[PDB]
Symmetry: C3
Subunit: 497 residues, 3 copies
Amino acid sequence: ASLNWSVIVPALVIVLATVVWGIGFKDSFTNFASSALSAVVDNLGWAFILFGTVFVFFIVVIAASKFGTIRLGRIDEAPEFRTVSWISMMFAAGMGIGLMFYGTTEPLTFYRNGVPGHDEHNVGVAMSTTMFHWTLHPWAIYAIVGLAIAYSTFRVGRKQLLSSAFVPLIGEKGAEGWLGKLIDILAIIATVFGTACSLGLGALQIGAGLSAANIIEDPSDWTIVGIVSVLTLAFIFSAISGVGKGIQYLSNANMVLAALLAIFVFVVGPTVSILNLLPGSIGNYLSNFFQMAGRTAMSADGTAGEWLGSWTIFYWAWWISWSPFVGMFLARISRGRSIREFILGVLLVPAGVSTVWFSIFGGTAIVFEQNGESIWGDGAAEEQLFGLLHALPGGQIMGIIAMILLGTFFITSADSASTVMGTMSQHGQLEANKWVTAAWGVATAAIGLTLLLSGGDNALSNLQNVTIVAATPFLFVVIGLMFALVKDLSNDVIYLE
Amino acid sequence: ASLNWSVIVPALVIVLATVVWGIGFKDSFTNFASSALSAVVDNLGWAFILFGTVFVFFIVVIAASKFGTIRLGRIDEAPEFRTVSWISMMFAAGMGIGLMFYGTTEPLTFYRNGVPGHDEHNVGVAMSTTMFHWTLHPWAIYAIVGLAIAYSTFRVGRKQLLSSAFVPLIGEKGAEGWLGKLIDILAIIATVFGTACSLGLGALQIGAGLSAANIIEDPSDWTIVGIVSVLTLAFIFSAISGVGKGIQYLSNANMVLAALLAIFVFVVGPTVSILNLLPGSIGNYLSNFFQMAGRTAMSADGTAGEWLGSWTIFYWAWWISWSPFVGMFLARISRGRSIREFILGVLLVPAGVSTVWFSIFGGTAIVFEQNGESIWGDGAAEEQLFGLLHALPGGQIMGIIAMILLGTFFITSADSASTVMGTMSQHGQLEANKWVTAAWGVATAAIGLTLLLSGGDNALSNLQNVTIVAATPFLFVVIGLMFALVKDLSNDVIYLEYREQQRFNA
Amino acid sequence: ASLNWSVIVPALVIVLATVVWGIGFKDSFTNFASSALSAVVDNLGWAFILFGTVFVFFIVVIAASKFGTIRLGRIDEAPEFRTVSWISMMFAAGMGIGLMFYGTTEPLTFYRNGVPGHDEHNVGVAMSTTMFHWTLHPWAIYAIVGLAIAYSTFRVGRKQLLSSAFVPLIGEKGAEGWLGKLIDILAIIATVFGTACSLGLGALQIGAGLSAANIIEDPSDWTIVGIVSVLTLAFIFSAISGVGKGIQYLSNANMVLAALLAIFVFVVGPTVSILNLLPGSIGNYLSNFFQMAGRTAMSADGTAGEWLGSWTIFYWAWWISWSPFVGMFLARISRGRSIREFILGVLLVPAGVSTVWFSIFGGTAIVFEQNGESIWGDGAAEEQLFGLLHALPGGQIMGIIAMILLGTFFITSADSASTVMGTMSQHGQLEANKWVTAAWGVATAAIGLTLLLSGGDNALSNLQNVTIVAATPFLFVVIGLMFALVKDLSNDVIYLEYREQQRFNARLARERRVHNEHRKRELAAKRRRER
Ligand SMILES: CCCCCCCCCCCCCCCCCC(=O)O[C@@H](COC(=O)CCCCCCCCCCCCCCC)COP(=O)(O)OC[C@H](O)CO
Ligand SMILES: CCCCCCCCCCCCCCCCCC(=O)O[C@@H](COC(=O)CCCCCCCCCCCCCCC)COP(=O)(O)OC[C@H](O)CO
Ligand SMILES: CCCCCCCCCCCCCCCCCC(=O)O[C@@H](COC(=O)CCCCCCCCCCCCCCC)COP(=O)(O)OC[C@H](O)CO
Ligand SMILES: CCCCCCCCCCCCCCCCCC(=O)O[C@@H](COC(=O)CCCCCCCCCCCCCCC)COP(=O)(O)OC[C@H](O)CO
Ligand SMILES: CCCCCCCCCCCCCCCCCC(=O)O[C@@H](COC(=O)CCCCCCCCCCCCCCC)COP(=O)(O)OC[C@H](O)CO
Ligand SMILES: CCCCCCCCCCCCCCCCCC(=O)O[C@@H](COC(=O)CCCCCCCCCCCCCCC)COP(=O)(O)OC[C@H](O)CO
Ligand SMILES: CCCCCCCCCCCCCCCCCC(=O)O[C@@H](COC(=O)CCCCCCCCCCCCCCC)COP(=O)(O)OC[C@H](O)CO
Ligand SMILES: CCCCCCCCCCCCCCCCCC(=O)O[C@@H](COC(=O)CCCCCCCCCCCCCCC)COP(=O)(O)OC[C@H](O)CO
Ligand SMILES: OC[C@H]1O[C@H](O[C@H]2[C@H](O)[C@@H](O)[C@H](OCCCCCC3CCCCC3)O[C@@H]2CO)[C@H](O)[C@@H](O)[C@@H]1O
Ligand SMILES: [Cl-]
Ligand SMILES: [Cl-]
Ligand SMILES: [Cl-]
Ligand SMILES: [Cl-]
Ligand SMILES: [Cl-]
């Protein structure tokens, strides 16, 4: 068994130490997450924001340049999968818990309260601000990490390790040293917290649906611990892959379920209004793109700092911490692809899905607010989806299917994250071990479950703050990854000819 | 000649079926017009607004691509005219009744009343919202229908028919079958209504111009029909005596008269303020482009849908319905041009016209408002050009001139458009029959009049509601054209030659 | 090479006359200046605004076009300076008295007062409206003139003269003719007034700065004169010892001082507020670029006119008149560069320095407003920097290196500008006469002085109105350059050969295709009904 302990030890130490400090000393850890938060959002907020937009310029430039004609693998190697399966796999890429949690909440919030530098009840700014958090910006980050890997791996022939994409800068000798193995630590850690966050929101939201439907009175810690345990244990099993039910038949299910949800709302809901929001969202997104990118704590006369720390800066941090996972995943399905094909696919396909989704769920929630039938309730994110569903014919049933799609996501995403996390802790092995995979998943579900307990009534608040913290170091890794990718792409063979 | 009665008849039925319904049962017609207008604007407005902007994106990307080097004709062919003569013909294409009618009215209305999403009395928004309706958007559609007809006619030797452009998707068999014919019929229907709308506006506007010159008490019904009838007959004269002699000669009048109005107002009006609106309009239009693109019934907190229906969605439908004609015209003058050079020319050249024309008329109207000398009057579009004219030295004369210009425009527009309808009904014959041509000119002017009459006090509202309803089926044609055109260009030999030299070397 | 007296005299007369009109009849000069301002802003205001943005597009299109592969010199000639030294000389270039004077004041002013079409206290608009006046728009102008001069001199091998750039429209006999000289004359007149503006600005600021350090409280003309005199003398004793030597070591102090000034206020002031304004500036700039570009006197319901002639248009005018100098400076340092390289550097680099400079100072000056610690004093630009500095731990010491800088900048600017004028009055001669250099230098300082004196209590308003009236003619020269520049690059050997190989290849391609097509028609004819 090839297990790089120099990276697995410090990684697992940070994880478990965070669990002790969380489950044991509630007040202590919940206070730490709130002051480190302010520390980062006030002193490094300008970096998350400035470079987040640089990632977008950089990535489409790389595509416009000659490096785009280059392929990922041997010279003039054909794509592994046929286009239609590459594209369809970038859908399950787009879909997920985040869109289940914020689909209704985010657009609804921005419409009601308004957004820094605009007044309340502005549909366009609501839709555009949402698109902004879920389209080009996150996937630019996913393309950077994904490319750096896919190139360092298929083309140049290195190990599928984040530290191997840093060779052009740190030398073949760095990746093997401590720095390369530090990169792999922060990679796994970021993935843990970035994934845990997802698991938290997932459980936090299902427990709410258990109350919406009256299967439960009101959720308690013993309920969230109940959900997380069933889903975690459901993961431990499926992690040790069987035959009949596989990780890629859950994606299929995820799809049909997600599709059933979306279609349902779309049809029974206000249809042409959702249709209006398609051009509506896109027009306004492009219209406000640079304004939104210019927003800082200095915006709206020194006022926007807090709104930022609860939305934009949270998402960026989250997107960063989640990059190793999504990046590696995007590499593993894009071998044989050209660098220009790869980027255009990453930036446009997932954006299609998120657009349609927020137009449906965000759209309906806003169409309710305009007709004096607010689904807002007591203003608790977790509840809002079920609020929207129960407001429509047959909405009773669809609320339960919603609970399942969430549980299957919990497990579907638990596998993917764990696998990659293992690959990164085994010197870059392709098919990781089912006993480290399952091990990482457990600690990932543990971390997540913790941030909900420590938080308590500020669980969502606590879930976010901690993410922004664990993602800060890795932010610079992704930044340097631009240079290491530029040096590599320059030292290529075709490009020299 | 070779008449395609299978096409002509179903197209001639609906038209006459409309004149009888409208001139026979005013109320039953106006009740259907206003009813359907609502179903289309409410259920399909998203479509006009989403694809209206997809068109602009599409046609620009096409030009940016390898397909751009291809030529509208045989390999390495070259243009028949100098590019200067090409530009001049596109300049003169940018003019017409629509500019006359809406040149003063539009940017004024937006300034007085304000625009959904904005405060009233906003100059930049008034102009940018106008540009939006009269530049890139309409010509992106003309370009799309032009490039399809040209590439089909000059690059592949198919008939100069719209259905021929759908060969890559429908096949040779299909383009001779029903689907192919349906496409040709919707083309002719869209052309007659989209043109009748032009003739209608013109008739209304000239009738209103008779009153401002005090040559009549009131634009009454037995006067509008008298205007249409006289101009219609003058079209017959110009039609039998060779359509060629008329169009080219009247265009001369058109450009001479038009140039006079424009320079008169430019020199006698607030010259400097008009000049400021040049970079003014361009800067704002670029600034607010995507903002305007994204506007729908959901915009402005869910309140903007009605404005949309009276403006944006109106124009889109109108540009769409007119596309077969102005596209066939764009093809017939653009052979041997490169696809890329063609796309840029069609977008930019007309834009400059509208841009200048609106800065002169709209800009002057706005300056009047600002200085407590509003020209708005009773708030009726047709009266407002004459409003602005009579507010100037010598304007009483120029008001007569603008009447003649509207008359010529009426005739050159019916000439041009009727020719294309000939071609579309004679299996793609370039020179139509002077009888099949004149036949269309009458049916068209008759529909123009049937729209005005059936309306009553709201002729304009009726003239816009029917146009939107009519143009609705053909919006989907133009959408599929995109898919058709890309399939063709992908099969083209020269471009297949470059992805052939890029798969070998690389 | 001989002095071109036919070009020298007419310029020196226009200048000397102005100095007379101003210092002789303060009340006849001020009037004409103020009446001509109106005439220009009202009638040509649209042209500055339209073409100011046209310049930006034009130069971006050139760089993107095939023209951008052409090298400014012999075919595949290597650059005189290395890539890293050239860039640095563009950093140092972008820093001037303009940055010192307006650095604090401009965004502060926009934040407090707002700009047409917006309300006060808009941080984004404050920063964006500033980027507009100090980034792409002026350096496009510079890039254009620099290119026309670099390509004309280094590639075609002509005289280093603006009249040369018009050879492809006017001819070698046109450039030697009256119009050609007229161009050079206007290029001189434009430069002296443009530099004079920068020199006046310097005096007003270094003057207010003596009264802020409480070193002088005799606020009068005998003091402003006392500054333009000492510094002018300093100019005459630097262009006499060797202008080529001073410009170097004198400039290297100009940067460390600028760097101490910058780093100081960045470290002591609201550091993470400033960092915040970096992406806040760039983003808001991109966001409002066209909205700003569309701002005319019909904007804000026919109201923006007044604000326009004090900010946007005065800057456009200022950048135009200063272009013969800046562009020539750029040409001379850019030899061996590709047109694209050059354009991409002239644009992107000075933008970096302006963006950071305005974030540090202007940003600091806005954070104070938000905290009720408002600087502004009596609302005077000339004082605001020193004001800002004083409210900082060290504002007294650093509020004096600012004094030095302004003087040092005064000298460096006068030296650089005077050289270009010499070359421009000596048939494109690189190293120009010593007494003819100091001559223009003195005369240029005389105008700046005059502008301030004829001005009175409103010295700026006068200093600006003139800079605008003296730039007007040269706006048409810069427009003409677009046409000249295109004619020239179109007849460049390397481009002609390229467009020639495109034809041959298409022709060659067509032969291969059309024949193969002929063969298939035969091969099909045999297989079918036949075989
Ligand atoms: C509204 C929605 C968003 C749309 C955003 C898209 C708009 C941007 C489009 C920009 C297209 C530019 C043209 C693309 C082709 C460029 C080809 C190119 O220059 O490649 C260079 C490579 O360029 C880069 O990778 C660096 C640039 C990356 C992007 C930086 C963006 C910074 C963003 C800051 C804000 C934006 C403004 C500044 C843009 C520069 C070549 O480098 P080299 O070979 O000289 O390097 C040798 C190496 O040093 C050897 O070791
Ligand atoms: C909604 C519209 C849908 C349209 C669907 C159209 C379907 C057909 C699209 C094309 C299919 C065939 C693709 C291959 C042929 C065309 C493309 C091609 O091969 O030509 C190249 C040439 O294309 C171009 O020159 C376009 C350059 C502009 C790209 C700018 C990047 C995007 C930034 C957007 C804003 C930028 C604005 C900057 C200035 C304001 C494109 O590659 P490249 O530009 O990445 O490479 C450059 C060089 O040739 C090879 O390295
Ligand atoms: C008015 C609206 C503005 C936004 C929308 C603009 C309209 C859309 C235009 C999109 C299509 C543009 C297509 C341009 C293709 C030009 C290609 C060409 O012919 O010249 C060369 C390509 O030209 C270039 O290299 C890029 C031009 C220089 C960089 C771009 C201009 C400077 C921009 C600086 C920023 C200033 C503007 C910022 C905001 C726009 C050929 O490419 P290459 O094979 O030499 O490229 C190799 C590459 O350099 C290395 O891989
Ligand atoms: C200040 C904002 C930025 C400026 C605006 C964007 C500027 C984009 C400039 C794009 C490059 C223009 C090059 C000019 C031609 C010089 C000679 C030349 O090099 O020819 C090339 C120039 O050819 C082009 O790239 C044509 C690009 C067409 C872009 C169309 C933009 C139209 C926008 C219209 C907007 C109208 C708005 C209305 C109000 C103004 C041919 O090569 P290619 O690039 O076609 O090759 C690519 C590929 O290998 C084969 O396709
Ligand atoms: C009508 C435009 C209104 C918008 C605002 C414009 C304000 C200025 C108007 C200037 C003319 C606008 C464009 C009018 C159509 C094109 C006119 C043109 O450019 O010349 C045409 C000739 O135009 C005319 O004879 C009638 C209109 C004349 C207006 C332009 C020429 C004016 C000549 C005197 C100008 C006086 C001032 C300058 C004197 C040097 C065509 O010449 P051609 O032989 O190349 O054309 C071949 C084509 O197939 C013919 O159909
Ligand atoms: C073809 C359609 C439009 C397309 C674009 C065409 C553009 C063609 C080029 C036009 C360039 C004109 C640039 C100068 C402005 C012209 C208008 C003008 O000068 O002011 C007008 C208006 O004049 C005024 O109201 C007063 C202006 C006073 C200007 C005084 C300037 C001289 C001041 C003396 C000192 C100058 C010192 C200069 C030192 C360099 C005078 O026009 P008008 O007399 O023909 O008509 C008057 C009005 O429209 C109707 O009665
Ligand atoms: C705007 C209102 C008044 C109208 C004024 C006139 C301007 C509008 C009309 C514009 C029509 C032409 C637009 C450009 C079309 C070029 C498209 C093209 O053909 O691609 C070529 C790209 O290359 C070029 O043709 C470039 C043009 C050659 C000269 C280059 C000049 C560049 C100058 C750029 C300055 C732009 C400044 C504007 C900025 C706002 C390569 O194909 P080709 O057919 O030219 O092949 C070459 C030859 O024909 C045989 O093969
Ligand atoms: C949103 C951006 C849109 C950009 C515009 C499209 C970009 C270009 C896309 C690439 C090429 C498009 C044209 C070809 C697409 C399909 C591939 C192809 O080559 O077409 C053939 C293969 O096409 C296909 O396999 C399926 C494509 C369907 C055919 C095209 C449909 C056009 C859609 C029009 C929508 C109008 C809606 C009307 C509703 C009443 C068609 O021949 P067929 O005999 O096989 O017929 C197709 C099928 O059997 C019919 O059932
Ligand atoms: O060569 C003729 C060929 O025609 C067939 O195509 C049919 C098939 O039904 C079908 O493949 C084809 O439609 C495919 C694309 C449909 C686009 C129709 C557009 C019409 C205009 C409005 C936009 C849409 O329509 C044709 C007519 O019904 C099939 O391609 C073959 O069976 C046959 O060989
Ligand atoms: Cl390759
Ligand atoms: Cl061809
Ligand atoms: Cl405005
Ligand atoms: Cl809105
Ligand atoms: Cl702001």
